[PDB]
RNA sequence: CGCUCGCCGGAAGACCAAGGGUUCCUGUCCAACGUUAAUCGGGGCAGGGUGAGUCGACCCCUAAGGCGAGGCCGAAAGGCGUAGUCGAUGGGAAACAGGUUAAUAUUCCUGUACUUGGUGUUACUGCGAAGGGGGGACGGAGAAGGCUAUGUUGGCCGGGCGACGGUUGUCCCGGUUUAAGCGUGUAGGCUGGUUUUCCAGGCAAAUCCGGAAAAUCAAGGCUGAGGCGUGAUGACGAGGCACUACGGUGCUGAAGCAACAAAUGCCCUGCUUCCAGGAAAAGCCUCUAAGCAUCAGGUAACAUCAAAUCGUACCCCAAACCGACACAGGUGGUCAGGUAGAGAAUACCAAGGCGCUUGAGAGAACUCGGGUGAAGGAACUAGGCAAAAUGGUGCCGUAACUUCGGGAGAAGGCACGCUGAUAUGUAGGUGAGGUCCCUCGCGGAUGGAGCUGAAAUCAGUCGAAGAUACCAGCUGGCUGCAACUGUUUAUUAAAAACACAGCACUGUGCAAACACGAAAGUGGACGUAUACGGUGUGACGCCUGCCCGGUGCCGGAAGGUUAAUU
RNA sequence: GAGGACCGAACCGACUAAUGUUGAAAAAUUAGCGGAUGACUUGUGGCUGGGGGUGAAAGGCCAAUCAAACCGGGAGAUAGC
């Protein structure tokens, strides 16, 4: 049992993009920004508990942050974790 | 047999092989094999400490029984074999109880021969006894220097030792070097001579044949510069000095034995 | 023509990395020196 | 964007490791960067993009080597190393085909699979390791056979009837693809099998391995490419049809066979042969010990659950890596089509990729890179430097000398294209139907349809020339030096120098001499005088003379002299 | 079907010439050249450290540095020039 307090911290935001929208309307898969240290099992439990939908499978990847310039200053955005969450057929989010 | 190669190429003109159509053609006996990787003549400081060693063929180590202390149980020679680790051939022997061992192959030993060790073994080639029980005047090999330590003298192909005398607890031996040496009579020895006497008749024939054996080139000191070797230097071929090692010690007759601990056992030096 | 710098990350880290520096007293004195100088990058360790 | 032209194509194509790190895709901008302009960019800015039980890492296991509790050694710092613990470049489970994005895909989707482990039932049951045994597990070269990848031709299906003479045909163009998995067990490779009794071996035990003695049977087992079947009534598929936001989308879809040739890939970790004699440890199989006893544990079937985490974009013979540059340099692995060809050479092409980020004119000297040259032909020059020349295959033929192998491709010379016949395509290779047999199958024998196919001879014929291009030895005579193949002054010296097999002297009895080291130790060597070190000489042939006064080395020890000490 | 065998690509070299010499390049390009089953060549990783290593020996090589590497220190060495 993953504690609800942990489940409430692992989902960070929906991910909005053309690929995400196509995933939702073609494969019943929603795309999320998730905490960097979240596992697939944690993501699955959090989606099921908080969004109240049944999940088929979770795929994950780590996005490396870009180096950016700002007023001659060089910086680097943080890496983050993206989750493609496939829902069971018939579920709607 | 000693076979001269035909001169179909300059590198084969001078080659002389020792071909023995009795050695096993298959693989060695695996339970008595160990790996043995190469050193390049370098010690654990990683420094070259013996020059002219490197490369050559990969070799597995055969565990050879130099102690010959399995007394009272006969063994039969199963086959003779090539051993890359030494000049002599070895023989795989099967004991009555089902144990197999490797021994140095004496001259004349062939598959089917029987061997034995111990105080009551027969006086026959390949049998091992304490020298107390071997007749004076006999020819023996694989001679111990301390009882139970294992054979250490006359192990190379074709070598043997003569038991010349027996006085009290000691026997006197004529070694291959010509030295007369006292050894405890409780030390063991194997009857006969080490086989493969034709080993010294081979001719390598080309440089590569030495490279196959792990021997790297010798560079003459007189071919170097003075910073490298006492012999180096000279506008042209010059020498003008007493021959020395690379470290400066005379190398044409100066003696280097210094062992007062073992002096008491040398009846007569080789010269 | 082959030049002198032929990069390998494993060799870089084994030769000059943080744990190699920590393995000897002389390497810990390199680190002490670079800290006293105030280097932003103490070692090659990426 | 289009049409044309040219260039690479064993790469200048495609794909990785390494290294780099957003360079990837889309929009937008042209200051600076880009050796020019730039509307373009690997440039600026913004947004997007990397989806795994099966690929890799992590992980289990070890090599060289590293570290190393105690330990041994050393003024200190430290050195070495035992038990151990790390360390890949090596050993260890499992996924394929098709479709899809602007950008990922063996990761997403469709279809069809597979592996390991945890639980829980059912049935049967001796399980148990830090120990024993097996296995893993290993070289070089060479030779075939059986195959596949792949190609070519025919058949089949669809389309065509030609910008200029001809083209309904023995004509032209295109396609003719299909995986892992599962089943079967073939060419081939290896091994006799089974059952009893006994035993100084495998640190104890062992039913396992090893050994000994009988009985009986003779075929039993292990391994194995390919093919065949299924996977697949599926997928893909030339083209056609309809819209386009003219970039491309949506629908449908024929044939989908055979013969021949054929690898450097597979059978093959095989086989034959040679000497220089060819890792380790775990996974895996098996044996028992202590111990546990209708318990645990094991075996099998079924069900269910789990297989986390990190990498995955993009460049990769390069404008993204190493070279200060968008630098004629360097960079390990994999793939390997057509015609000619021995070929991965070479020429022209395919797929695919490119015209090298200043151009426009002109048509002086001179420089660079090339082409041709009257007569002469080394007169040039230090020197034939450079250039010119030779150049293939088959056959004829080939001297001195020689260590009998060589020299030798010595030298020199002849033939060579195309067409027809021999022979509507030969010798040879391959091989279907049919027939016979069978211990009936992926079988044997016969049989030869079909396919493929040199080489030769005779006759004819075109050109100045038939190894026509690219490609592709110049040859001979005397002589110095080094025997030879090798090595060397990275960047002015490749040699006659170094090495070398062979030879000799000499040291070295093993705790070897010797070498690294205040030392412990380590190398020498798990070697032992037919061995190991040092030194000189340098294949081989015939040989290697005289001198021990000097210097050194070896032996001697009666005498002289002589240190600390007393 | 032997061989430090033979011809010859890849691969490893570097004998000659021209060019280049503020280079396309701080050692190359082009035409020729040698080895090409071996004393061969190559990837990954390891080991040897400065009077020290390694050296088929050229005082060669040890990061475009070698008759004693590089960096820091004694250090403002000393300099009848
Ligand atoms: Cu004295
Ligand atoms: K031997
Ligand atoms: K020499
Ligand atoms: K000299
Ligand atoms: K000299
Ligand atoms: K000289
Ligand atoms: K290093
Ligand atoms: K430029
Ligand atoms: K312009
Ligand atoms: K842009
Ligand atoms: K080790
Ligand atoms: K170790
Ligand atoms: K299961
Ligand atoms: K073999
Ligand atoms: K066809
Ligand atoms: K026409
Ligand atoms: K039998
Ligand atoms: K199949
Ligand atoms: K076991
Ligand atoms: K990818
Ligand atoms: K070409
Ligand atoms: K002009
Ligand atoms: K002009
Ligand atoms: K003719
Ligand atoms: K036929
Ligand atoms: K025929
Ligand atoms: K030729
Ligand atoms: K000579
Ligand atoms: K040369
Ligand atoms: K030399
Ligand atoms: K000697
Ligand atoms: K001779
Ligand atoms: K000779
Ligand atoms: K003399
Ligand atoms: K003398
Ligand atoms: K005296
Ligand atoms: K190697
Ligand atoms: K040196
Ligand atoms: K440096
Ligand atoms: K120095
Ligand atoms: Mg992932
Ligand atoms: Mg941050
Ligand atoms: Mg050490
Ligand atoms: Mg030597
Ligand atoms: Mg040896
Ligand atoms: Mg020698
Ligand atoms: Mg010299
Ligand atoms: Mg000197
Ligand atoms: Mg002279
Ligand atoms: Mg003189
Ligand atoms: Mg001296
Ligand atoms: Mg590398
Ligand atoms: Mg264009
Ligand atoms: Mg950028
Ligand atoms: Mg781009
Ligand atoms: Mg500009
Ligand atoms: Mg402008
Ligand atoms: Mg950009
Ligand atoms: Mg999935
Ligand atoms: Mg895998
Ligand atoms: Mg240690
Ligand atoms: Mg300690
Ligand atoms: Mg480990
Ligand atoms: Mg590995
Ligand atoms: Mg892509
Ligand atoms: Mg074992
Ligand atoms: Mg192996
Ligand atoms: Mg082999
Ligand atoms: Mg085929
Ligand atoms: Mg096929
Ligand atoms: Mg017409
Ligand atoms: Mg056709
Ligand atoms: Mg099929
Ligand atoms: Mg080959
Ligand atoms: Mg990719
Ligand atoms: Mg450019
Ligand atoms: Mg370049
Ligand atoms: Mg290369
Ligand atoms: Mg071709
Ligand atoms: Mg070519
Ligand atoms: Mg094309
Ligand atoms: Mg002109
Ligand atoms: Mg000119
Ligand atoms: Mg000309
Ligand atoms: Mg002329
Ligand atoms: Mg003319
Ligand atoms: Mg003329
Ligand atoms: Mg003439
Ligand atoms: Mg003249
Ligand atoms: Mg003149
Ligand atoms: Mg010339
Ligand atoms: Mg020419
Ligand atoms: Mg001649
Ligand atoms: Mg065929
Ligand atoms: Mg040419
Ligand atoms: Mg002369
Ligand atoms: Mg020579
Ligand atoms: Mg070299
Ligand atoms: Mg030079
Ligand atoms: Mg040169
Ligand atoms: Mg020792
Ligand atoms: Mg010692
Ligand atoms: Mg030792
Ligand atoms: Mg000489
Ligand atoms: Mg005298
Ligand atoms: Mg004396
Ligand atoms: Mg050769
Ligand atoms: Mg060189
Ligand atoms: Mg060249
Ligand atoms: Mg040659
Ligand atoms: Mg060649
Ligand atoms: Mg110093
Ligand atoms: Mg000199
Ligand atoms: Mg240098
Ligand atoms: Mg000095
Ligand atoms: Mg001072
Ligand atoms: Mg000063």
Residue pair B91/B137 in contact by the 8 Å Cβ criterion: no
Distance C16 CA to ligand 62 centre (A): 26
B215 token code pair: 């021997």
Chain B span 18-47 residues with beta carbon within 7 Å of strand E: 42, 45-47
B134 token code pair: 């071997």
Cβ neighbours of residue B206 closer than 8 Å, sequence gap 6 or more: B11, B12, B14, B15
Closest CA to the C1' of D77: that residue is C25
Contact positions of strand E to protein Cβ (< 7 A): 2-5, 25, 27-28, 38-40, 44-49, 53-59, 63-64, 67-68
DSSP C1-46: ---S----HHHHHHHHSHHHHHTSHHHHHHHHHHHHHT-S--SS--
CA B41 to chain centre: 19
Distance between CA atoms of residues A39 and A58, nearest Å? 9
- The answer to whether some atom of strand D lies closer than 7 Å to the beta carbon of B260 is no
Closest by Cα among B4, B10, B3, B8 to B207? B10
Distance B212 CA to ligand 32 centre (A): 27
Query: A87: helix, coil or strand?
Result: strand
Torsion angle of the four alpha carbons B46, B52, B57, B62, in this order, in degrees rounded to the nearest 10: -70
Distances (CA, A) of C12 to B109, C8, C17, C45: 59, 6, 7, 8
- The answer to whether some atom of strand D lies closer than 7 Å to the beta carbon of B8 is yes
Distance C30 CA to ligand 112 centre (A): 18
- Å from B89 (CA) to D403 (C1')? 34
B94 token code pair: 């099967």
All structural domains of chain A: 2-93 (3.30.70.330)
Residue pair C26/C32 in contact by the 8 Å Cβ criterion: no
Looking across all nucleic acid strands, the nucleotide with the smallest C1' to CA distance from residue B98 is D211
Distance B121 CA to ligand 63 centre (A): 50
Across-strand partners of B184? B170
Looking across all nucleic acid strands, the nucleotide with the smallest C1' to CA distance from residue B216 is E56
Tell me, letter by letter, the H, E, C secondary structure of chain B.
CEEECCCCCCCCCCCEEECCCCECCCCCCHHHEEECCCCCCECCCCCECCCCECCCCCCEEECECCCCCCCCCCEEEEEEECCCCCCCCEEEEEECCCCEEEEECECCCCCCCEECECCCCCCCCCCEEEHHHCCCCCEEECEECCCCCCEEECCCCCCCEEEEEEECCEEEEECCCCCEEEEECCCEEEECCECCHHHHHCECCCHHHHHCCCECCCCCHHHCCCCCCCCCCCCCCCCCCCCECCCCCECCCCCCCCCCCCHHHEEECCC
Distances (CA, A) of B95 to B60, B66, B239: 24, 16, 61
Torsion angle of the four alpha carbons B226, B232, B237, B239, in this order, in degrees rounded to the nearest 10: 100
CATH architecture of the domain with range B1-113: Beta Barrel (2.40)
Distance B229 CA to ligand 100 centre (A): 28
Closest by Cα among B214, B242, B219 to B230? B242
Residue with tokens 């200053």: A73
B120 token code pair: 């009551």
Instruction: Please give the biggest Cα pair distance in chain A.
Output: 52
Looking across all nucleic acid strands, the nucleotide with the smallest C1' to CA distance from residue B211 is E39
Which method resolved this structure? cryo-EM
Q: What are phi and psi of B21, to 5 degrees?
A: -85, 35
Question: Dihedral sign, CA of A42, A43, A48, A52?
Answer: positive
Question: Dihedral sign, CA of A41, A43, A48, A50?
Answer: positive
- The answer to whether some atom of strand E lies closer than 7 Å to the beta carbon of B234 is no
Residue pair B105/B125 in contact by the 8 Å Cβ criterion: no
Distance between CA atoms of residues A57 and B258, nearest Å? 82
Distances (CA, A) of C7 to A89, B44, C44: 51, 29, 13
For residue A48, with 0-12 CB atoms within 10 Å meaning exposed, 13-18 middle and 19 or more buried, which class applies? middle
Query: A66: helix, coil or strand?
Result: coil
Across-strand partners of B128? B117, B190
DSSP A11-37: EEEE--SHHHHHHHHHHSEEEEEE-TT
B93 token code pair: 């022997």
* Chains touching C (3+ CB pairs < 8 Å): none
Closest by Cα among B177, B159, B185, B188 to B268? B177
Residue pair B108/B125 in contact by the 8 Å Cβ criterion: yes
Domain boundaries, chain B: 1-113, 117-194, 195-271
Across-strand partners of B95? B75
- Å from B234 (CA) to D454 (C1')? 70
Tell me, letter by letter, the H, E, C secondary structure of A30-45.
EEEEECCCCCHHHHHH
- The answer to whether some atom of strand D lies closer than 7 Å to the beta carbon of B197 is yes
- Class of domain C1-46 (CATH, top level): mainly alpha
Looking across all nucleic acid strands, the nucleotide with the smallest C1' to CA distance from residue C2 is D330
Distance between CA atoms of residues A20 and A61, nearest Å? 14
Report the topology of domain B195-271: Ribosomal protein L2; domain 3 (4.10.950)
Distance between CA atoms of residues B85 and B26, nearest Å? 17
- Å from B9 (CA) to D485 (C1')? 10
Closest by Cα among B208, B210, B211, B205 to B14? B205
- The answer to whether some atom of strand E lies closer than 7 Å to the beta carbon of B204 is no
Looking across all nucleic acid strands, the nucleotide with the smallest C1' to CA distance from residue B70 is D200
């Amino acid at each position: 049992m993953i504690r609800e307090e942990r489940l409430l911290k692992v989902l960070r935001a929906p991910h909005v993009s053309e690929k995400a929208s196509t995933a939702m309307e073609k494969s019943n898969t929603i795309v999320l920004k998730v905490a960097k240290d979240a596992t697939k099992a944690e993501i699955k439990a959090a989606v099921q508990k908080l969004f109240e939908v049944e999940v088929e499978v979770v795929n994950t990847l780590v996005v490396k942050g870009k180096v950016k310039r700002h007023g001659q200053r060089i910086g680097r955005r943080s890496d983050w974790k993206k989750a493609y969450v496939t829902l069971k057929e018939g579920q709607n989010l | 047999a000693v076979v001269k190669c035909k001169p179909t190429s300059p590198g084969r003109r001078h080659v002389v092989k020792v071909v023995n159509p009795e050695l096993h053609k298959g693989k060695p006996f695996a339970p008595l094999l160990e790996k043995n990787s190469k050193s390049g003549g370098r010690n654990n400081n990683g420094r070259i400490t013996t020059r002219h060693i490197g490369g050559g063929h990969k070799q597995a180590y055969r565990i050879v029984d130099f102690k010959r202390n399995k007394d009272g149980i006969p063994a039969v020679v199963e086959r003779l074999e090539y051993d890359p680790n030494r000049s002599a051939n070895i023989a795989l022997v099967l004991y009555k109880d089902g144990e197999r061992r490797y021994i140095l192959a004496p001259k004349g030993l062939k598959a089917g021969d029987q061997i034995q060790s111990g105080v009551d073994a027969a006086i026959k080639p390949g049998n091992t006894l304490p020298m107390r029980n071997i007749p004076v005047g006999s020819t023996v090999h694989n001679v111990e220097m301390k009882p139970g330590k294992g054979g250490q003298l006359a192990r190379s192909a074709g070598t043997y030792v003569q038991i010349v005398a027996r006085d009290g607890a000691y026997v006197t031996l004529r070694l291959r070097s010509g030295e007369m040496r006292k050894v405890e009579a409780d030390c063991r020895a194997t009857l006969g001579e080490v086989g493969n006497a034709e080993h010294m008749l081979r001719v390598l024939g080309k440089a590569g044949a030495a490279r196959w054996r792990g021997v790297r080139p010798t560079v003459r000191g007189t071919a170097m510069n003075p910073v490298d070797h006492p012999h180096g230097g000279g506008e042209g071929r010059n020498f003008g000095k007493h021959p020395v090692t690379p470290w400066g010690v005379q190398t044409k007759g100066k003696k280097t034995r210094s062992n007062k601990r073992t002096d008491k056992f040398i009846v007569r030096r080789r010269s | 023509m082959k030049r002198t710098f032929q990069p390998s990350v494993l060799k870089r880290n084994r030769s000059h990395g943080f744990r190699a520096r920590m393995a000897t007293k002389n390497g810990r004195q390199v680190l002490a020196r670079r800290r006293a100088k105030g280097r932003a990058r103490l070692t090659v360790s990426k």
